[PDB]
Amino acid sequence: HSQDLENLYFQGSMNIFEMLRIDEGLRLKIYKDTEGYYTIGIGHLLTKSPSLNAAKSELDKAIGRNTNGVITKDEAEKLFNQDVDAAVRGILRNAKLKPVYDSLDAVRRAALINMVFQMGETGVAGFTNSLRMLQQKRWDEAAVNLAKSRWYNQTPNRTKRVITTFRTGTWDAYKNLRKKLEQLYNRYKDPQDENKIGIDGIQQFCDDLALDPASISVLIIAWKFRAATQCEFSKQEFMDGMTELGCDSIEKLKAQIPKMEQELKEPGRFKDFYQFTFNFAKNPGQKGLDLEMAIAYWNLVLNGRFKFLDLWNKFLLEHHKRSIPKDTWNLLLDFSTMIADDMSNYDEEGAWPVLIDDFVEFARPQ
Ligand SMILES: CCCN1CCC(N(Cc2ccc3c(c2)OCO3)C(=O)Nc2cccc(C(F)(F)F)c2)CC1
């Protein structure tokens, strides 16, 4: 009962959790962070173990049920609140942070905690001049000074909101952000289902971004938004992606697209994108991907990368209808990577899909 959120009902509805939900984002399924470690919620590290089962054990232990690696928002808030309590304890025994923290009102304390989550105690303690201004209630001067920092350059939109919070002592920046995202989402949402954007809204989104829906850039955007399926774009996907990408407008999203595209050059990221495509393309009711749909997506994602793509098309157009399983999809990229220009190094004993064995027999003589 100690962690029950009902114990916080005397607070405002806006709080540090909701603040970090906007500034960092909330994930309700176990995922791997930057450094490859299993994480959930708002940046809550579960374990450094490579074992997902280990991560699930820790999570189940913490939540008190068999989660299967999926939690609710309220469960994420409980984890986050533990983390906040630890951050506050640290602040309160730090001679450079305690005096300013103690001096601040509740809303501005949240802004300081936000900073500590982003940059750690040492990072925040480096702002000696600005912290002194805050301790002295010189809010406008503190705001001006913080805006000159590398922090501002690293995360300008988050930093601006945190600074506004210090300037005003209100949640205005966060109310405004939420409203801006709601109003933007409302431009695209399905009028018959407010939980998602349908085909017409996706088209409008593409048009607003000046992109052809058939372009690889649109698939890259879906990948960055971790979209579940090609047929719709959920409210949760839209909000989570805009949050993760640090964007509260179409202009900002447009400026981010080239950066998304560049990520495909970093280690493992093209493979991640390629594998994502299968799940996105497949009918949610089906386990495999219809061959015709697989061809369409292969032609988008592998053109200019897979030197045998045209022969692959010729091969498949002769083939009978089948569901392409995930493993066959995934292994085609590995085939593309290893295969010699004349196919002379294919290992028939490599446990490739039969489809690829058959392709090599078809192609070697062409
Ligand atoms: C070779 C693969 C081509 N590809 C297939 C999927 C098409 N499509 C759904 C869509 C988008 C626009 C359409 C349409 C269907 O029919 C008419 O106009 C989507 O990408 N949907 C989508 C779903 C969630 C998020 C997003 C995204 F974030 F905008 F990128 C797009 C876009 C074109």
Q: How far is the CA of 219 from the centre of ligand 1 (A)?
A: 7
The amino acid present at 339, given as its one-letter code, is I
145 among annotated binding-site residues: yes
Looking at residue 268, its amino acid is: G
13 known ligand binder: no
Q: How is residue 310 written in tokens?
A: 């045209």
Distance of alpha carbon 283 from alpha carbon 297, whole angstroms = 13
Compute φ and ψ for 337, nearest 5 degrees: -65, -40
Known binder of ligand: residue 333?
Answer: no
Distances 278 to 298, 330, 344 between C-alpha atoms, Å = 9, 8, 28
Strands in 193-197's sheet, in edge-to-edge order, are 189-190, 193-197, 233-234
Distance CA 283, CA 228 (A): 10
Q: Which two tokens stand for residue 136?
A: 């002295």
Q: Calculate the CA dihedral of residues 9, 11, 17, 18 and round it to 10 degrees.
A: 100
Resolution (Å) of this entry = 1.1
User: What gap in Å lies between CA 174 and CA 170, rounded to an integer?
Assistant: 9
Alpha carbons 299 and 360: distance in angstroms, whole number: 19
| 25 CB within 6 A, ligand 1 | no
Method: X-ray
Which mutation among 195, 202, 234 tests ligand 1's pocket best, with the greatest number of atoms within 8 A of CB? 202
Helices 139-146 and 128-135, axial angle in degrees (round to 10): 160
Q: Which amino acid is at 128?
A: T
> What's the gap in Å between 230 CA and the centre of ligand 1?
5
Q: 25, 243 in Cβ contact below 8 A?
A: yes
Cα separation, 174 vs 293, whole angstroms: 42
Residue identified by tokens 């470690």 is 37
Contact 166, 142 (CB under 8 A): yes
Q: Is 251 a catalytic residue?
A: no
For CATH 1.10.238.200, list the domain ranges present in the chain: 269-364
Dihedral sign for Cα 321, 323, 329, 331, please: negative
- Residue 55 CA to residue 45 CA, distance in Å, equals 9
- Residue 281 C-alpha to ligand 1 middle, in angstroms? 10
Question: Where does the chain hold its CATH 1.10.530.40 domain(s)?
Answer: 5-172
Can you read off the two tokens belonging to residue 278?
């299968």
Q: 5-172 adopts what CATH topology?
A: Lysozyme (1.10.530)
Q: Is 149 annotated among the ligand-binding residues?
A: no
| CA distances in angstroms from 10 to 54, 140, 243, listed in the order given | 37, 30, 28
303 lines ligand 1 (CB under 6 A): no
How far apart CA 138 and CA 254 sit, in angstroms, is: 37
Q: In what order do the strands lie in the sheet with 27-32?
A: 27-32, 38-41, 44-47
Report the alpha-carbon distance of residue 59 to residue 54 in Å, rounded: 9
Q: Give the whole-angstrom CA distance, residue 280 versus residue 228.
A: 5
Please say if 244 is a catalytic residue: no
Question: How far is it, in rounded angstroms, from Cα 180 to Cα 103?
Answer: 32
User: How far is it, in rounded angstroms, from Cα 72 to Cα 82?
Assistant: 16
Q: How many residues does the chain have?
A: 366
Closest CA to 122 of 95, 161, 100: 95
The answer to whether 3 and 81 are in contact (CB under 8 A) is: yes
Which of 78-104 are b and which e, b meaning 16 or more Cβ less than 10 Å from the residue's Cβ? Answer: bbbbebbeebbeebeebeebeebbeeb
d(CA 71, CA 8) in angstroms, rounded, equals 20
Backbone angles phi, psi at 46, to 5 degrees: -95, -35
Q: Ligand 1, residues 218, 237, 280, 300: which to mutate, most atoms within 8 A of Cβ? A: 218
Is 70 near ligand 1, meaning CB less than 6 Å away? Answer: no
Give the mutation target among 224, 230, 237, 283 for probing the ligand 1 site: most ligand atoms within 8 A of CB: 230
The C-alpha atoms of residue 95 and residue 277 are separated, in whole angstroms, by 51
- Using alpha carbons, list the distances in angstroms from residue 129 to 126, 146, 244, 346: 9, 9, 30, 65
286 Cα to the center of ligand 1, angstroms? 19
**Which residue out of 6, 18, 23, 24 is catalytically annotated?**
24
Selecting from 3.40.50.1820, 3.40.50.720, 1.10.238.200, 1.20.140.10, what CATH number does the domain 269-364 have?
1.10.238.200
Q: With helix as H, strand as E and coil as C, how does the chain read? A: CCCCHHHHCCCCCCCHHHHHHHHCCCEEEEEECCCCCEEEECCEEEECCCCHHHHHHHHHHHHCCCCCCECCHHHHHHHHHHHHHHHHHHHHCCCCCHHHHHHCCHHHHHHHHHHHHHHHHHHHHCCHHHHHHHHCCCHHHHHHHHCCCHHHHHCHHHHHHHHHHHHHCCCHHHHHHHHHHHHHHHHHEECCEEEEECHHHHHHHHHHCCCCCCCHHHHHHHHHCCCCCCCCEEHHHHHHHHHHCCCCCHHHHHHHHHHHHHHCCCCCHHHHHHHHHHHHHCCCCCCCEEHHHHHHHHHHHCCCCCCCHHHHHHHHHCCCCCEECHHHHHHHHHHHHHCCCCCCCCCCCCCCCHHHHHHHHHHCCC
